[PDB]
Amino acid sequence: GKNLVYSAPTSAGKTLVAELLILKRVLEMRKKALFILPFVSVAKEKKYYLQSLFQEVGIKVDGYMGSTSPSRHFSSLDIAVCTIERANGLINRLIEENKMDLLGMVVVDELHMLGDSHRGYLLELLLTKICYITRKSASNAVQIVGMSATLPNLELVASWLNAELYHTDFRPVPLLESVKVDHVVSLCYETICDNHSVLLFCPSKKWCEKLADIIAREFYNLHEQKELLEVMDQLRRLPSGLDSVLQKTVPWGVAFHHAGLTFEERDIIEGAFRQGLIRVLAATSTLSSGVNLPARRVIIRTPIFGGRPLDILTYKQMVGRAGRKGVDTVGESILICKNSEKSKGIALLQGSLKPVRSCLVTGSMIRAILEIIVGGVASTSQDMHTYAACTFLAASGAIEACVMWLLENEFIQSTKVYHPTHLGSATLSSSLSPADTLDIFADLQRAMKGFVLENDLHILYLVTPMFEDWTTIDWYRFFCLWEKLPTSMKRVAELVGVEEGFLARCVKGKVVARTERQHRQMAIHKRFFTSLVLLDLISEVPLREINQKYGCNRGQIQSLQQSAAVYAGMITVFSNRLGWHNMELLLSQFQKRLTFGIQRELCDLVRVSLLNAQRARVLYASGFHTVADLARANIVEVEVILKNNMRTIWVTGRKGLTEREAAALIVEEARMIL
Amino acid sequence: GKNLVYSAPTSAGKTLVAELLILKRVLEMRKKALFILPFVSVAKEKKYYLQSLFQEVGIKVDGYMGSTSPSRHFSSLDIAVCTIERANGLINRLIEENKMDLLGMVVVDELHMLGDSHRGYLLELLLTKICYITRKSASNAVQIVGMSATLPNLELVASWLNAELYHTDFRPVPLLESVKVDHVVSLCYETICDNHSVLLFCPSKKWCEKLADIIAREFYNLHEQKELLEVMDQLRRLPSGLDSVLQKTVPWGVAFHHAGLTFEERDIIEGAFRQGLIRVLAATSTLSSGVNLPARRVIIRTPIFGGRPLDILTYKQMVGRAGRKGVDTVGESILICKNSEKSKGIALLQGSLKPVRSCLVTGSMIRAILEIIVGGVASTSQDMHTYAACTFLAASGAIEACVMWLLENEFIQSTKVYHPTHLGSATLSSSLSPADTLDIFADLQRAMKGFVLENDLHILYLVTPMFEDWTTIDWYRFFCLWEKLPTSMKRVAELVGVEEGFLARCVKGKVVARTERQHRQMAIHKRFFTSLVLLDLISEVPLREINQKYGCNRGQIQSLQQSAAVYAGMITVFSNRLGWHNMELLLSQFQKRLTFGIQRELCDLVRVSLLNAQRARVLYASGFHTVADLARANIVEVEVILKNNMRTIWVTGRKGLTEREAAALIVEEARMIL
Ligand SMILES: COc1cnc(C(F)F)cc1-c1cc(C#CC2(O)CCOCC2)ccc1C(=O)Nc1nnc(C#CC2CC2)s1
Ligand SMILES: COc1cnc(C(F)F)cc1-c1cc(C#CC2(O)CCOCC2)ccc1C(=O)Nc1nnc(C#CC2CC2)s1
């Protein structure tokens, strides 16, 4: 239990040691074990893998990722496969409840994210809290395991965590990088004829789509069917339907994969590629850091990604997907280059990834100081400097500035001992950034004075996150929708701050320059557009109808859905801790409605993990209005309902599931819930 | 199963035949059975009696009375002991759900209330619906039983109900009357010497307390202790404490009973009297129609009750309490008179009660027409006249006026067939009078545009009933409280319509004359005062603090509490049916908080019938925050918690309950709830 930090190339079973360590620790010490993954998709995949691997040893695995949380108390859990942000929140709650001793280990995957990133600083704060608590209160307290690619300063990380060091460059399928600069058709024919898959990485979504289209066209001109038809049918019966370009590309063993698709379409395509049904997959940079999707040959369109040379870490994790362990002998990663791009390509071929920074006046430092002070682990400046010493920044005088910032804004109170007042405790529990918590407090307080209960829009405006630009707003369509809005929605629009003058300015004149800090008035109108999108979402309108009405594709709609669900949960916890009972009561429902995009009636019916928003409606419209009512039903009835040996329905982390046993599992899990 | 209507003097076991019939029908047909009582106190007493009687025969008895409702679905019930209005609502819901065939019989007690009364018309419409649905679809489907005093037109009632007729004047303790030679002291001395109790009836509250005072003083000057001390201690530990006058009146076997007291104090006094602990009880007119409280000698202070001769029905039910069946030989009811009051006294001594009216443009007819049309039992004018014929008024052309009234106000839609739109269905389900439902709709709709969620005052203003004058508002104190009000409450005050000008007018100038219909603005300020009282009630402040702060006594506070609880439940059902999900969500909690006068935290902890608002807090402050937590606890722990072989705590329908075994039932019923 002396911690550990090791690195190794992916596609070499590098997580096996971690799984072994969690198994041994959980079985011996009978203590919990977090498993921090960077992204929600890989987190879900790991959660399902661990569930399958440990279901036979009486180990409960259920993670805190995305907008979801385990249906059972954390006490019952044995392994929690959470994400970075939600793992930080979990550790904050454990510290708050003075039950940190339940934790036995914190396994962190993809530790290289500690460096430059908007979520790495959360990992740094999490690990710093682990180290500080472990050292202040002691051999076998809390083990930390790390993972990453080749890290230039991996030994620095091990020293910071006071852990071992193991670095090895060994992969069963030795990769053969080769840059080369007619013959394209011959190359495609000879690559496909070898009975191996190909993974292309293109910079643009549109260019990925078009390149997949031309490859499918060339395969058609130069020209298993049953399994490909099965995949096509699976794609057909989805809420977003089937994409026409994807329709004409899929049945030729060619497809595309980008953030524009929906999570279900991406999952279907990834599964088809994994089984070999899809031979060529044109993905984007997002898939590079996504699920484990090995390919015999990887190809990179151009090092220019988004008007800039491709990142070295991104390129490394792209080439890491070249080679199948068990069935393939060697792997190839081609990077086509041009006369002008030859220098950039040669630069990318050589050189390892850059060293890991710390990303620590800065909001990260304000957050860390708030976490320690509110958690009751560093109340005096004498020891807070010790926490600073524990940070990765130290191991590689802003505290006084940050502590004043918290006293200036009434996050903490001085007495020289420091304490939180109400917003310090409510800000930490909600896992909201202290910078945005002031605006959230001001907006929620203003809402409770004049709330509009006519519709769901005023509640949506308060749970709409504007921390990132999910889509480029088409202001002409927004103005048309505005002039077509009801009076009930226009009341909330005027209440929040939306003005027809600004909309008119944007409709014809160019987007107003937000050169001044007082011009958060632009954020209000973007937030109202987003809240209208969310209202259409939770009103259970189809994704395509939203896309036509608003211009946001289905992938962006789903991303906004997840962001709004997480933000609604966070705001609900904030209101609960602040003692706003009516606001919390109104916001409590919206987290699940936004997670699934359903109506109030289906909220109870979606507690069954095996029930989409569309599958909840067809069962609800039939007459099953409750999970208990589901438990009392024959399998044949639900099967005929779903209809109105072929694997046609898709569910996350599925198996050889068709509509026959899908009905069987719906009732079986309904019984389990009761 | 041919219905029945019988009459007999009270104290003659008139309910024995009804109990026999309900037992027979429930055991044979295995169908439900309603037991309609006029008042909540007598309804509770009858519910407990039926529970004790039929627990051993596997018959579940649970009543819909007051602000309470059974914790189990009506399907599981075997007998429902409901009140007139809640039985009417129950039958309306059964008609709406097309399950009136579930009933087996409807036993009605105190049928004479059908005449002049504000609640008899509900009984009339209830029985009219029963007999109409019986005749339309077959006459042995739902047996009806009746009870009353000597009705001059009992045969007419039986003919209306097409039922049998039995009228007997039999009482084992015959009542005597003879004038024989302030001549009250010797009367009291000789009545108390022979070891008998006395029940005095007085026309007011203050004079009742004063007469109790003088009687106790005389007994003290002219002179079981353990049981009286037990009663005194029971009165001691109550939320309202012990009355400064009752404290010195009780030890001498003398007490008083009026609406000013709390329900618990009235229950304690009644129980003490029934056991013989209290030898003299000065009650008021309310006790006349209350629980069964026999007394050897009844006395009536004066026929003038509230500036008018005592009612004949009221006098008959007063003298009905003269004579104990089983221990007494004869009973007497003295009516002291004066030279001027001799004529009124002799007039009231002779003569039976007046004939029963029907109390049917009138709001009762609008309600009946709405009930039949919305229930789907009379949708065409051809049959609605059949319903009119089925009424008691017919058996002893306004429909067209009422039907237009409902169409004018959009309660129903004509097509010639009639249907409800949304307010017709929402008005019937909520059991709200259609006359007040328009104001309720207008007020709720206005609230959902500018709701104030800072506090509970805006929710309270919408669940505050102003159907009766519960107290005389002291406007100087109200203006002072207004001056000291926070800004958050003043915001809702201005939103609802409260004005400083009107309060200033009332503070100094005489009460403004509401001679015009547009002066419902006076009702707004009374409603706001009542809503402030309710806010302090649900904030869990003591009754005495509210009385000092507002001037309303504890009895009036409790009456307003029950009225507001019932109205909150009704408004919640109204909002649910109208599709106002946020309003319903906000109003859902408040019914229980008003029923018990507790905070949000104790709502789950009061699900145990053996937990007051003070006992919920005492257990809650200790650490029991849930019924499940209460179940998992040793009896001795809860016993010591309550303490911080003597019966000192009081619960409704109690037995020889001591604190030692009181904690035993708290955990026992806590387990039963789970
Ligand atoms: C209160 O916080 C949440 C509530 N609810 C949800 C859920 F409903 F979605 C998610 C969160 C959450 C969101 C982010 C975030 C984030 C962004 O990156 C994206 C969205 O916008 C802001 C930035 C980070 C952390 C949390 C969080 O606290 N998680 C936890 N839940 N239980 C816990 C426990 C426990 C006891 C065992 C000890 S810890
Ligand atoms: C929806 O109506 C209520 C809701 N909730 C409460 C409770 F919470 F208090 C009480 C009522 C209620 C109040 C009055 C009244 C009255 C006033 O005299 C006093 C207050 O102000 C207006 C006049 C009259 C009737 C009802 C009522 O419908 N009862 C029922 N409940 N379940 C039922 C069923 C069923 C299925 C088996 C078939 S039927």
PDB file of N, CA and C in Angstrom, chain A residues 445 447-456 459 491 495 580-583 585-586 589-590 600-601, chain B residues 445 447-456 459 491 495 580-583 585-586 589-590 600-601:
ATOM      1  N   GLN A 445     -31.127  34.040  -6.471  1.00  0.00           N
ATOM      2  CA  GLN A 445     -31.803  34.925  -5.530  1.00  0.00           C
ATOM      3  C   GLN A 445     -32.791  35.836  -6.244  1.00  0.00           C
ATOM      4  N   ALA A 447     -34.335  35.140  -9.006  1.00  0.00           N
ATOM      5  CA  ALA A 447     -35.441  34.331  -9.508  1.00  0.00           C
ATOM      6  C   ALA A 447     -36.501  34.108  -8.439  1.00  0.00           C
ATOM      7  N   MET A 448     -36.084  33.824  -7.205  1.00  0.00           N
ATOM      8  CA  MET A 448     -37.052  33.513  -6.159  1.00  0.00           C
ATOM      9  C   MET A 448     -37.962  34.690  -5.845  1.00  0.00           C
ATOM     10  N   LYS A 449     -37.579  35.907  -6.230  1.00  0.00           N
ATOM     11  CA  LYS A 449     -38.435  37.063  -5.990  1.00  0.00           C
ATOM     12  C   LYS A 449     -39.574  37.144  -7.002  1.00  0.00           C
ATOM     13  N   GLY A 450     -39.352  36.667  -8.223  1.00  0.00           N
ATOM     14  CA  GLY A 450     -40.320  36.834  -9.290  1.00  0.00           C
ATOM     15  C   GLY A 450     -40.527  35.608 -10.153  1.00  0.00           C
ATOM     16  N   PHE A 451     -40.440  34.419  -9.564  1.00  0.00           N
ATOM     17  CA  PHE A 451     -40.443  33.198 -10.359  1.00  0.00           C
ATOM     18  C   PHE A 451     -41.741  33.048 -11.146  1.00  0.00           C
ATOM     19  N   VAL A 452     -41.616  32.484 -12.345  1.00  0.00           N
ATOM     20  CA  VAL A 452     -42.740  32.212 -13.233  1.00  0.00           C
ATOM     21  C   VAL A 452     -42.950  30.705 -13.252  1.00  0.00           C
ATOM     22  N   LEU A 453     -44.080  30.251 -12.711  1.00  0.00           N
ATOM     23  CA  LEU A 453     -44.411  28.834 -12.671  1.00  0.00           C
ATOM     24  C   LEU A 453     -45.342  28.416 -13.802  1.00  0.00           C
ATOM     25  N   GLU A 454     -45.658  29.323 -14.728  1.00  0.00           N
ATOM     26  CA  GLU A 454     -46.550  28.971 -15.829  1.00  0.00           C
ATOM     27  C   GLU A 454     -46.008  27.791 -16.623  1.00  0.00           C
ATOM     28  N   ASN A 455     -44.709  27.797 -16.910  1.00  0.00           N
ATOM     29  CA  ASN A 455     -44.082  26.781 -17.740  1.00  0.00           C
ATOM     30  C   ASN A 455     -42.775  26.358 -17.084  1.00  0.00           C
ATOM     31  N   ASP A 456     -42.035  25.504 -17.782  1.00  0.00           N
ATOM     32  CA  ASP A 456     -40.767  24.974 -17.305  1.00  0.00           C
ATOM     33  C   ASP A 456     -39.577  25.816 -17.746  1.00  0.00           C
ATOM     34  N   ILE A 459     -37.364  27.650 -14.850  1.00  0.00           N
ATOM     35  CA  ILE A 459     -36.509  26.687 -14.169  1.00  0.00           C
ATOM     36  C   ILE A 459     -35.364  26.273 -15.079  1.00  0.00           C
ATOM     37  N   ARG A 491     -42.690  36.360 -20.916  1.00  0.00           N
ATOM     38  CA  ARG A 491     -42.606  36.916 -19.570  1.00  0.00           C
ATOM     39  C   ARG A 491     -41.288  36.534 -18.909  1.00  0.00           C
ATOM     40  N   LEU A 495     -38.031  38.720 -17.840  1.00  0.00           N
ATOM     41  CA  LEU A 495     -37.566  38.629 -16.458  1.00  0.00           C
ATOM     42  C   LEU A 495     -36.069  38.361 -16.390  1.00  0.00           C
ATOM     43  N   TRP A 580     -32.596  26.805   0.401  1.00  0.00           N
ATOM     44  CA  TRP A 580     -33.663  27.242  -0.498  1.00  0.00           C
ATOM     45  C   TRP A 580     -34.512  26.022  -0.826  1.00  0.00           C
ATOM     46  N   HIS A 581     -35.545  25.795  -0.014  1.00  0.00           N
ATOM     47  CA  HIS A 581     -36.303  24.553  -0.114  1.00  0.00           C
ATOM     48  C   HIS A 581     -37.214  24.543  -1.335  1.00  0.00           C
ATOM     49  N   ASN A 582     -37.854  25.671  -1.646  1.00  0.00           N
ATOM     50  CA  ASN A 582     -38.743  25.708  -2.804  1.00  0.00           C
ATOM     51  C   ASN A 582     -37.956  25.626  -4.106  1.00  0.00           C
ATOM     52  N   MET A 583     -36.833  26.338  -4.188  1.00  0.00           N
ATOM     53  CA  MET A 583     -35.988  26.247  -5.373  1.00  0.00           C
ATOM     54  C   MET A 583     -35.463  24.829  -5.555  1.00  0.00           C
ATOM     55  N   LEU A 585     -36.872  22.098  -4.462  1.00  0.00           N
ATOM     56  CA  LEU A 585     -37.999  21.255  -4.840  1.00  0.00           C
ATOM     57  C   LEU A 585     -38.301  21.382  -6.325  1.00  0.00           C
ATOM     58  N   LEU A 586     -38.278  22.607  -6.851  1.00  0.00           N
ATOM     59  CA  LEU A 586     -38.537  22.793  -8.274  1.00  0.00           C
ATOM     60  C   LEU A 586     -37.428  22.187  -9.126  1.00  0.00           C
ATOM     61  N   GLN A 589     -36.631  17.628  -9.852  1.00  0.00           N
ATOM     62  CA  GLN A 589     -37.098  16.795 -10.953  1.00  0.00           C
ATOM     63  C   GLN A 589     -36.229  16.960 -12.192  1.00  0.00           C
ATOM     64  N   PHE A 590     -35.771  18.182 -12.465  1.00  0.00           N
ATOM     65  CA  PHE A 590     -35.213  18.504 -13.773  1.00  0.00           C
ATOM     66  C   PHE A 590     -33.939  17.738 -14.097  1.00  0.00           C
ATOM     67  N   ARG A 600     -42.505  14.560 -17.102  1.00  0.00           N
ATOM     68  CA  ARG A 600     -42.605  14.236 -15.682  1.00  0.00           C
ATOM     69  C   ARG A 600     -43.127  12.822 -15.470  1.00  0.00           C
ATOM     70  N   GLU A 601     -43.991  12.346 -16.368  1.00  0.00           N
ATOM     71  CA  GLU A 601     -44.628  11.047 -16.166  1.00  0.00           C
ATOM     72  C   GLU A 601     -43.631   9.904 -16.313  1.00  0.00           C
TER      73      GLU A 601
ATOM     74  N   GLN B 445     -53.763  31.333 -11.254  1.00  0.00           N
ATOM     75  CA  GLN B 445     -53.173  31.730 -12.529  1.00  0.00           C
ATOM     76  C   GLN B 445     -52.306  32.970 -12.370  1.00  0.00           C
ATOM     77  N   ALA B 447     -50.764  33.874  -9.670  1.00  0.00           N
ATOM     78  CA  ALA B 447     -49.587  33.527  -8.879  1.00  0.00           C
ATOM     79  C   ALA B 447     -48.496  32.915  -9.745  1.00  0.00           C
ATOM     80  N   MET B 448     -48.871  32.074 -10.706  1.00  0.00           N
ATOM     81  CA  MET B 448     -47.883  31.385 -11.526  1.00  0.00           C
ATOM     82  C   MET B 448     -47.155  32.310 -12.491  1.00  0.00           C
ATOM     83  N   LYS B 449     -47.395  33.619 -12.440  1.00  0.00           N
ATOM     84  CA  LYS B 449     -46.657  34.572 -13.256  1.00  0.00           C
ATOM     85  C   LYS B 449     -45.639  35.374 -12.460  1.00  0.00           C
ATOM     86  N   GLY B 450     -45.845  35.529 -11.156  1.00  0.00           N
ATOM     87  CA  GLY B 450     -44.953  36.321 -10.332  1.00  0.00           C
ATOM     88  C   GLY B 450     -44.649  35.687  -8.992  1.00  0.00           C
ATOM     89  N   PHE B 451     -44.592  34.359  -8.943  1.00  0.00           N
ATOM     90  CA  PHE B 451     -44.480  33.673  -7.663  1.00  0.00           C
ATOM     91  C   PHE B 451     -43.206  34.069  -6.928  1.00  0.00           C
ATOM     92  N   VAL B 452     -43.317  34.188  -5.609  1.00  0.00           N
ATOM     93  CA  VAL B 452     -42.201  34.519  -4.729  1.00  0.00           C
ATOM     94  C   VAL B 452     -41.806  33.251  -3.988  1.00  0.00           C
ATOM     95  N   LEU B 453     -40.608  32.742  -4.272  1.00  0.00           N
ATOM     96  CA  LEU B 453     -40.115  31.518  -3.658  1.00  0.00           C
ATOM     97  C   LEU B 453     -39.169  31.778  -2.493  1.00  0.00           C
ATOM     98  N   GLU B 454     -38.986  33.037  -2.094  1.00  0.00           N
ATOM     99  CA  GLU B 454     -38.091  33.326  -0.979  1.00  0.00           C
ATOM    100  C   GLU B 454     -38.562  32.633   0.290  1.00  0.00           C
ATOM    101  N   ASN B 455     -39.869  32.643   0.537  1.00  0.00           N
ATOM    102  CA  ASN B 455     -40.449  32.107   1.757  1.00  0.00           C
ATOM    103  C   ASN B 455     -41.694  31.307   1.396  1.00  0.00           C
ATOM    104  N   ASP B 456     -42.389  30.823   2.421  1.00  0.00           N
ATOM    105  CA  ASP B 456     -43.606  30.046   2.244  1.00  0.00           C
ATOM    106  C   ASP B 456     -44.866  30.898   2.260  1.00  0.00           C
ATOM    107  N   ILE B 459     -47.070  30.723  -1.006  1.00  0.00           N
ATOM    108  CA  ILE B 459     -47.773  29.447  -1.086  1.00  0.00           C
ATOM    109  C   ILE B 459     -48.889  29.401  -0.056  1.00  0.00           C
ATOM    110  N   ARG B 491     -43.024  41.857  -0.154  1.00  0.00           N
ATOM    111  CA  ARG B 491     -43.129  41.670  -1.597  1.00  0.00           C
ATOM    112  C   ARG B 491     -44.366  40.854  -1.950  1.00  0.00           C
ATOM    113  N   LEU B 495     -47.813  41.804  -3.865  1.00  0.00           N
ATOM    114  CA  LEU B 495     -48.206  40.990  -5.012  1.00  0.00           C
ATOM    115  C   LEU B 495     -49.659  40.546  -4.907  1.00  0.00           C
ATOM    116  N   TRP B 580     -51.218  21.866 -13.665  1.00  0.00           N
ATOM    117  CA  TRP B 580     -50.233  22.811 -13.140  1.00  0.00           C
ATOM    118  C   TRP B 580     -49.255  22.024 -12.279  1.00  0.00           C
ATOM    119  N   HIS B 581     -48.175  21.555 -12.906  1.00  0.00           N
ATOM    120  CA  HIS B 581     -47.276  20.626 -12.230  1.00  0.00           C
ATOM    121  C   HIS B 581     -46.412  21.328 -11.191  1.00  0.00           C
ATOM    122  N   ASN B 582     -45.923  22.530 -11.496  1.00  0.00           N
ATOM    123  CA  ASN B 582     -45.083  23.239 -10.535  1.00  0.00           C
ATOM    124  C   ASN B 582     -45.896  23.719  -9.339  1.00  0.00           C
ATOM    125  N   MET B 583     -47.100  24.236  -9.586  1.00  0.00           N
ATOM    126  CA  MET B 583     -47.968  24.638  -8.485  1.00  0.00           C
ATOM    127  C   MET B 583     -48.319  23.445  -7.608  1.00  0.00           C
ATOM    128  N   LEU B 585     -46.556  20.725  -7.254  1.00  0.00           N
ATOM    129  CA  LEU B 585     -45.348  20.322  -6.544  1.00  0.00           C
ATOM    130  C   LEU B 585     -45.111  21.202  -5.327  1.00  0.00           C
ATOM    131  N   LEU B 586     -45.296  22.513  -5.475  1.00  0.00           N
ATOM    132  CA  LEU B 586     -45.105  23.409  -4.339  1.00  0.00           C
ATOM    133  C   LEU B 586     -46.159  23.176  -3.263  1.00  0.00           C
ATOM    134  N   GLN B 589     -46.431  19.514  -0.350  1.00  0.00           N
ATOM    135  CA  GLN B 589     -45.902  19.381   1.002  1.00  0.00           C
ATOM    136  C   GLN B 589     -46.809  20.037   2.032  1.00  0.00           C
ATOM    137  N   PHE B 590     -47.453  21.148   1.672  1.00  0.00           N
ATOM    138  CA  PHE B 590     -48.047  22.026   2.671  1.00  0.00           C
ATOM    139  C   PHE B 590     -49.247  21.414   3.381  1.00  0.00           C
ATOM    140  N   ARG B 600     -40.451  21.175   7.281  1.00  0.00           N
ATOM    141  CA  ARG B 600     -40.267  20.205   6.208  1.00  0.00           C
ATOM    142  C   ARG B 600     -39.575  18.945   6.709  1.00  0.00           C
ATOM    143  N   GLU B 601     -38.689  19.084   7.696  1.00  0.00           N
ATOM    144  CA  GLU B 601     -37.893  17.944   8.143  1.00  0.00           C
ATOM    145  C   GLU B 601     -38.747  16.916   8.876  1.00  0.00           C
TER     146      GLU B 601
END
